[PDB]
Each structure stands twice: as C-alpha cells, then as structure tokens.
Amino acid sequence: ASRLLLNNGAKMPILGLGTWKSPPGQVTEAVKVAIDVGYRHIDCAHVYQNENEVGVAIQEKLREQVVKREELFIVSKLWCTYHEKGLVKGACQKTLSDLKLDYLDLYLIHWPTGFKPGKEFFPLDESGNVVPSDTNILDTWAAMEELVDEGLVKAIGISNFNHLQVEMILNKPGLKYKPAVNQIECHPYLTQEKLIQYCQSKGIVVTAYSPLGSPDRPWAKPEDPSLLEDPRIKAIAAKHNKTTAQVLIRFPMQRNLVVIPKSVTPEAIAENFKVFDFELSSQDMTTLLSYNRNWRVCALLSCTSHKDYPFHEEF
Numbered sequence: 519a520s521r522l523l524l525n526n527g528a529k530m531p532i533l534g535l536g537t538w539k540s541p542p543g544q545v546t547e548a549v550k551v552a553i554d555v556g557y558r559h560i561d562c563a564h565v566y567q568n569e570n571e572v573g574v575a576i577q578e579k580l581r582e583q584v585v586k587r588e589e590l591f592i593v594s595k596l597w598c599t600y601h602e603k604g605l606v607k608g609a610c611q612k613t614l615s616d617l618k619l620d621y622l623d624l625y626l627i628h629w630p631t632g633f634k635p636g637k638e639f640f641p642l643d644e645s646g647n648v649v650p651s652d653t654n655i656l657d658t659w660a661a662m663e664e665l666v667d668e669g670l671v672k673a674i675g676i677s678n679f680n681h682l683q684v685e686m687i688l689n690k691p692g693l694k695y696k697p698a699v700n701q702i703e704c705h706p707y708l709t710q711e712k713l714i715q716y717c718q719s720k721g722i723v724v725t726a727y728s729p730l731g732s733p734d735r736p737w738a739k740p741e742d743p744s745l746l747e748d749p750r751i752k753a754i755a756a757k758h759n760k761t762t763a764q765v766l767i768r769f770p771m772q773r774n775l776v777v778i779p780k781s782v783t784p785e786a787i788a789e790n791f792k793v794f795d796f797e798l799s800s801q802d803m804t805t806l807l808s809y810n811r812n813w814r815v816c817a818l819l820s821c822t823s824h825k826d827y828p829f830h831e832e833f
Contacts, residue, residue, distance in 0.1 A: 520794060522776060524698045525721050526673045528623065531559035531591050532771055533793065536727065536778040542568040549575035551784060553585055555791050561725075561778045562617065563595035563628060564609065565639055569616035577618050592617065593624040595677060596662070599639065601632030601653045606661035610670055625671040626701055627662065629678050629818065630655055630826040640820070648820050655683060655826060656690050663694045675699035678818075680831040681716045688720065699723045701778075703816050704770060705731040706745060706809035712833040714775065725776040730766055732815040750805060758796045761789060768793045769806050 521529035535557045540548055545568045549560065553575070560576075562569050576592070579585050594617070600609035610625060632651030634641040641649045662674045675698045676684070687697060700717050704710045704726035714724045730745055745751060746762045755762045767790055770777040779790045798806070814829065821827050 519771075522723050522774065524624075524673055524723055525696055526698055528591075528672060530624070530699070530723065530776060531557075532776050533557065533767075533791065534559035534561045534591075534593075534725070534776060534778045535787070536561050536781045537566055537568055537572055538563070538727075538778075539780065539782055540566070540568060542571045546571045546575045548781065548784070548787060550579060552781070552787050553579045555788060557787075557791065558585070558589055559591040559593070559776075561593050562613070563597070564613050564616075565595070565597045565628065569594065569613055573616055573618040587619075591623045592619060593626060594622055595626040595628040596658075597639065598629050598631055598633040598651075599635050599641065601627075601651050601658040602635055603653070603657045603661045605635060606658060607665065607668075607670075610665055614670065621669065622671045624673045624675055624698060625662065625665060626675045626677045626699070627655075627658065627679075629821075630676070630680075630683050630828050631818070631821050631824045632658065632826070648824070650821075650824050655686060659687055659690060666695055673698035675701070675722075677701040678703075678816075678828055680828045681713055681833050682831055683826070683828060684717065684720070684722070696720075697722055699725050699776070701725040701727060703728050703814060704775065705729050706766070706769070706806055707731050707735075707811045707813040708815075709807055709810040710833070711807075711810075714773065716833070718774070723776060725778060726770040727778045728815060729770055729777050729779055730763065731813070735813070737811075745809075754798070754802050754805065757802075758798070760792075760796060763789055764793050765798070765802075766806075768796065768798055769803075772798055772803060 521531050535552045549572055594613045632653040634649040665671045717724050751762050755765045781787050
C-alpha cells in the first residue's frame with residue numbers, strides 16, 4: 519500500500535514531496551535529500567517558480583544512478599493564465615524544459631478558474647480585481663487530452679474542482695481521457711468525505727494537500743493547543759510510538775488518498791517519510807475523522823465572482 523493504481527494503469531506513490539513554498543535557492547538540495555531518503559513522487563507547479571531548480575536535482579540523482587526515471591513520478595500543474603486552448607501545449611513544454619524532462623507522469627489543471635493570458639500570474643483591474651478568461655473548462659480539457667496523445671504527459675488530472683466540475687468533464691461529448699486524479703485540500707478540519715466518495719466511485723484518485731491544515735484557526739485562542747499538540751492526537755501518536763505529524767500524514771493514506779505534506783525543512787522531509795511501518799486502528803480513524811469543521815484554508819477569495827469558482831457548491 520505504498521502506490522495507488524491510476525486509470526491509465528500506472529502506479530502513483532502514495533507519498534509525494536511538495537515543492538510548494540520551497541524557495542529556489544533551497545529546493546535543489548531539498549529534492550536531492552528527498553530522493554536519497556526514498557521519495558519517488560515529486561509534486562511541482564509552474565507558479566511555484568522553482569521548477570528549474572527541481573530539475574537540476576532530478577538529473578543529478580539520475581546521473582548518480584540512485585534512481586531511474588521510470589521509478590520517478592513527476593507531476594506539474596497548468597497555471598490559470600494558460601487555460602486558452604492554444605496556450606496549453608506551450609505551458610506544458612516550458613515546464614518540461616524547466617524540469618529538464620522528456621515527459622511528465624501527470625499534469626494537473628491547477629484551478630478551474632481561467633485568467634486573462636499574459637506575463638502576470640494574477641492579471642488585474644485598475645481596481646485590482648483579477649481579470650477572468652472567457653475560456654470553458656471543456657476547451658482547456660481538449661487541449662490537455664492532446665498532450666497525452668502527443669506523448670508529453672502520461673496522464674492528466676485536475677485540482678480544486680468541485681464534483682459538478684468533475685461531472686462536466688466526465689460528460690464531455692467525445693471524451694478521450696478521464697481525469698486520473700483530483701488534488702484537493704484535506705486535513706482533520708476539512709475531511710472532504712463527500713467529494714472523495716464521489717471521486718473514488720468514478721475511479722479518480724484523490725491527492726490531499728495541506729494535511730496539517732493552517733496554524734491560524736479563527737475559532738482558537740492563542741493558548742489553544744495546535745493539531746500537533748492536541749492531547750487526543752498525542753495519545754494516538756504515543757500508542758504507535760510515532761510523532762503527531764507522522765500520525766496526521768498516515769491519516770489520509772489510510773483513506774486511500776495520496777498525500778503531499780508541506781516539506782519546507784530538512785527535518786520535515788525526513789520525519790514525513792517514516793509513515794509506512796505502522797497502521798492507525800479503526801478507533802484512531804474515527805477520532806481523527808471527528809475533528810471536521812468543514813474549514814477551508816485555501817479558498818482563493820480573490821476569485822469568488824469568477825464563473826468557474828469551485829467553492830460556492832457544497833462539494
């Protein structure tokens with residue numbers, strides 16, 4: 519149970535190294551260390567602006583022969599300003615060039631929301647409002663399918679899509695390729711039970727990001743213990759001779775989810791990998807599931823009036 523089978527027949531490692539919020543000056547060393555520790559799935563995106571530095575690490579370790587490229591599962595994401603049908607291919611080719619790779623194992627639509635094309639990641643009004651694209655989700659999906667046909671990516675998928683937006687793609691006339699994964703926010707305060715039940719029933723693998731939530735909770739007093747120091751979670755950790763971070767990474771894994779932890783320190787990278795030698799019990803799982811408050815941290819609030827804004831729906 520350290521890889522999950524995708525609908526293209528490939529196996530995706532259930533633990534991924536995130537490069538989100540890893541600075542370019544540090545990320546090459548972070549990825550090298552990760553591959554030495556045993557990470558094989560690495561999660562990138564153009565908007566992180568560090569893909570070139572990730573690429574240096576990968577082909578250093580490929581030269582050293584500690585890993586072969588067919589053992590690596592590399593994913594990247596199409597940013598919102600490239601949703602136009604004519605631009606998707608070049609966005610993909612730029613990422614491949616940065617990563618110094620021939621193909622990606624998976625390529626995700628980052629958000630369902632398309633922005634006006636250009637150099638800016640968030641194109642703006644004279645009043646500072648994000649300017650939408652007029653593009654359809656189905657049009658940019660057509661362009662993503664072409665990437666699989668041309669052999670540039672092995673599978674395509676989506677990120678932060680609600681179930682109605684998934685159904686829209688599943689009902690595309692002449693659909694060639696179904697989404698292989700939907701990458702979503704998932705942690706004890708937002709357990710996403712409905713959306714993951716929907717996805718898994720359609721054969722779509724769910725990847726959790728931000729599995730520890732955010733430290734800044736709107737209901738909590740500054741003296742209230744965090745998730746990592748919560749007494750009941752500490753008790754579960756003590757029971758298994760594990761850290762509380764390790765318990766919270768294992769939590770999604772046992773729901774048959776892929777998990778991308780925040781991996782911004784060398785300590786976290788080493789700690790987060792030690793999650794394969796234990797299993798949480800039924801009682802542990804019910805306890806961890808009971809923290810849900812449907813609290814969403816990554817809500818992309820700047821785009822609430824966008825027609826394809828995902829989070830007005832319940833799931």
